[PDB]
Amino acid sequence: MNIFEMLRIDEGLRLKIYKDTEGYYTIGIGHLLTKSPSLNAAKSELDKAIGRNTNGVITKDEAEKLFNQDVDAAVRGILRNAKMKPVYDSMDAVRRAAMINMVFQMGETGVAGFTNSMRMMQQKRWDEAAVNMAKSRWYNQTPNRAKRVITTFRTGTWDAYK
Ligand SMILES: [Cl-]
Ligand SMILES: [Cl-]
Description:
- The PDB classes it as hydrolase.
- This protein is mainly alpha-helical.
- It has helices at 3-11, 39-50, 60-80, 85-90, 93-111, 115-122, 126-134, 137-141, 143-155, and strands spanning 14-19, 25-28, 31-34.
- The chain binds chloride ion (CL) (2 copies).
- One chloride ion binds at residues 142-145.
């Protein structure tokens, strides 16, 4: 188990434009194309990303290429963030994967309202942070996923994924 398998379980794999759980256009392994209601807009973003006239459809290889880039950008976003970097550095590898999953799903922006949980996490108060994290829109909207991620932080093991 690793970050790639972990997120691939959480996001699934789709080769045609689809609406995520927030109603946004997405494709591949959770790659958000656009927050706009416009599908054409979404199709243009897709072509731009892939480098061709996709017609709203990509192959498995293109999906995987997007996913590599996105996981790479999530990490780097953490590291560049002044408030995140230190939490991230204080953690073991498993818990770091949990942090990358959340950044992947919600952006540096969404993860940033998790300040309190993060400070507990820094202090290694796992059970408490798990509880606080559950008090969120995030847990409310995608509970099964949220649960998997929270156990992961809580335990520091891959159990919720095995
Ligand atoms: Cl892109
Ligand atoms: Cl869910």
